[PDB]
């Protein structure tokens, strides 16, 4: 069952990003805090939509896609990925990682249903690395 | 109005990009027409130094984020 | 039986030569078109009288005579010329080629009667080569610069025109055009070509690249 | 038997390109008109030599080569090309498409002799697409 | 009038030759007197650069066409 | 000191590269840290024309020799 | 047995490179001189370390590697390379060419022991071509004009230098030099070349003619 | 003295040739050395207009009479 | 028997050439007058030596040689020249025309002995034409 | 076996030409010194490439060609040339003199193999005369 993040925590994090900036160690610590439980693509996408401005959000979408593509290359380079399965029918496509696959587009409940925990942690680590890249790039 | 937005002579590029993306996304365009419009407004607005910087891009930039990253990398520090 | 060329086609060709000039590829194509069927000396002479001015016509008469003389030298060097015959009584004199022989002076019907088809095609090829010579003669690449306000396609057109219509060998035009694109073509485009992540090894590729990445203004 | 295009039509088309430009819809309609019957490489080459200036002609040669190469890749990807045959001895090389093969260089009669109708229509479509590309590029 | 034709300071040589041959052939001279007159008008008109170019001709030019060819070959490109 | 080396406004690039490589190799750095330092000093020193020339490199340059070759090819002749 | 090159010759060559530069014909002649006997990778490597600065040495290492890789591609494309053998056990790896193979690293004696004469001459030719590339790279003909006060021999020297030290094919230099003599070389010499009763078909002949008939001033 | 004879700025060429041939033939030179001296004095004296006129002779002039004829033909009428 | 021309007439002709020039019709008439009887090469040579300056005399020697060469070409083109004979032993060489043949060099008496009247009139006409050429050339 | 000239002597001669000029008697003496042994076309060509500037080198190539052509005319005028042989198969073409013949282009060893000593001395004398002409012409 999907539970959304508190809008109070999200508002506090957005104001933190607004006053301290993207690169302050306190901001990265707060992001790591709100990045503790494995989030669904819907959660991370809406979170970055709210806390980041338009141009940093575009940059972050780009960087997140690139990092997810590196993850999928490593996944096709190793059939023992915690997102993959043993047979070929469990291979994870980027539509399933970005939340674009069938039964997931716009629906967080179905998303949480079909996604694997390894998928969730890989998406989360990818999003964190992308946030770091964009923060280092913006300023 | 998005089609009246120009990058001022003294304005930085991230401020211009913020203003333009704001005015384009908060407008009456369909959702599937915002990215091409933002790109083509980056190319024709954004005073001729950045215009030539985007024109002479050895790679093809097909996303506002990629254009912003490229311009921020190769911009004239001043 | 002799049939004259249409004065309508001749008028259109004359106006083409008047507006486009003698050396344009469209003009040479039109001349090749009106040079399709083997013409009698009368036809080619009147055609050049009408389409060419007085001084180009004098030059063309000179060049036509020289080329016909080369043809007659090759003919006396080979008794199997399509204008010649097997015996010595069919040897073709320049009076017969220029239409000056007996029974031909001023009369196109008699001309068409006595002339051979090989004679006609040789006269026609000679006249075409003479026209080419005079056109190349009647009308500098290393002095061409791209003006401050000129576009790049106009500069490329002018440069390629002046380089291909010059005295360079055919195998030296592309490298010269490239190296002139690189050193002329004012420093904005110079730096645009210099910072090319790919290696451009053809004038067409350079033109395409510059047209893609040019500063819209 | 090869029949050349009328120099009157070619002169009218050249003046159309001279006054209206390369990209006007009337110019493209006129080109489509003179591109009605399948032309031999000699015909299209001389046509573009006459109607186009030197630099657009260089660009058009480049684009025509690229499009013909795409056609030959599709041809080696499908042995049922109307230019190809069933056996391997009918495979069509770029020397045969550009008119550079043996018995064709400079001779339009021999060209018309050895070429296939599928070859002719493929060459013609390739030349039309190349003209469109160059027209979109020049202005 | 043929005897009043001069090559202008800015005029090219083929235009001057065209004008002169036109005025000489469309005049009251006998047919056997046109070529010598055209030659001697090329030599005395046709401003002193081309005058000296024709004067210092290592070969003898005995026809208007030959003079035109020689001058077109050795003319000062400008 | 290697970290104080700048390319002068009038200095050529091969002289700057010679001076920088000399000061970096004749210093207290480990041998495995000289190439990355030389590259990152080419990128941040070497006044902004060459900085932008290296930044807009369609290929990725991963060696001081490759950077030197690229810059020598595409440098602004002056 | 390995014999080192004289440090006196190496010092003289280094000072030659220091004063004349990398691209002078005297410098290339001196390098060809010291490149006469087939050198071991150790010799050429130390030679380029001594005569070249740090940045040209890096460039030269790059170019030498690329040329050796082309050589090894040609070697795997032909089993009859003078560096190769007939069986597969004599195939020459780049570690053996660059001196990195086993029993060769840092030891010139062992190097000279295991290397083939074909290997040595291939390495030497590769190093010479790499030196040529780097020299052409370390340091525009269509922009050269004869100054109002400049003499003609200086202009000809500058133009021939810039044309021969450029990217043109070898068969396109003479026509370009001639056509640049004709269109550059301010209008007095332009008219002097134009009114040439003879046809000049060589840069040397044009230079001789102009030097004969030039306006002494 | 023959070696001191120059063609004056206003003097015609036939007067200069007369004076020079007179002074050369009425001197102490051997008879077999007069023609080469007269030729080489025509070439080096005879102020630079005629000097260049003789220099650019498509034919080789090997006699004082031939040089005189050539110069009289192609001289600048003034 | 050879009789020399009067030095009084030669002095008057020289002063005429000195005052009127080479091209005046009175000068040409006077030359035609002193060119009435067929002169020997010695006579014409000395006459031109006296009346002409050094440079016109060189030009006249050249022109006289050229005209005599044309005459000798016409003579070898027709064996019925009044200077020639019927057999090949009477063919007239340029040494006999210019007075350079054997028994003639410097001796006017021997000259008058061996020369033919046709030879004399041909030499005279040649000299007159050469004088005309040089006069037209000098001014 | 071919032995190259010392680059030290060539450098000294080049500096002599640079300071004293082309026409000084000391320079001509030095050239005669380095022109002592019969040189192959490769040697003389590279020597003139190094010691002479670009424009004097062009002039020297022209003059050397002209002098070699005069030599070949004298050779076809006398079958007893030290470069020629007795039969017609040893006649020396300009491709063999300028080093352009087969087996000689760019290879000094093969050059030294096929060339005759008479060929070498004729080439050397021709090059010396050409150097004299160019030196008299340059200044």
Residue numbers in the entry:
A (entry chain H), D (entry chain C), I (entry chain J), J (entry chain F): 10 to 148
B (entry chain G), E (entry chain A), F (entry chain D), H (entry chain I): 152 to 229
C (entry chain B), G (entry chain E): 10 to 148, 152 to 229
Paper text:
As the virus buds from the cell, the viral protease cleaves Gag into several fragments, including the capsid protein (CA) that then assembles into the mature capsid shell (core), rendering the virus particle infectious. The CA portion of all retroviral Gag proteins folds into two separate domains, the N-terminal domain (CANTD) and C-terminal domain (CACTD). In mature lattices, CANTD interactions form only intra-hexamer and intra-pentamer interfaces, while CACTD interactions are also involved in formation of inter-hexamer and inter-pentamer interfaces. Our results show that, like lentiviruses, RSV is sensitive to IP6 in vitro and in cells, where in the mature CA lattice IP6 binds in a pore formed in the center of the CANTD hexamer.
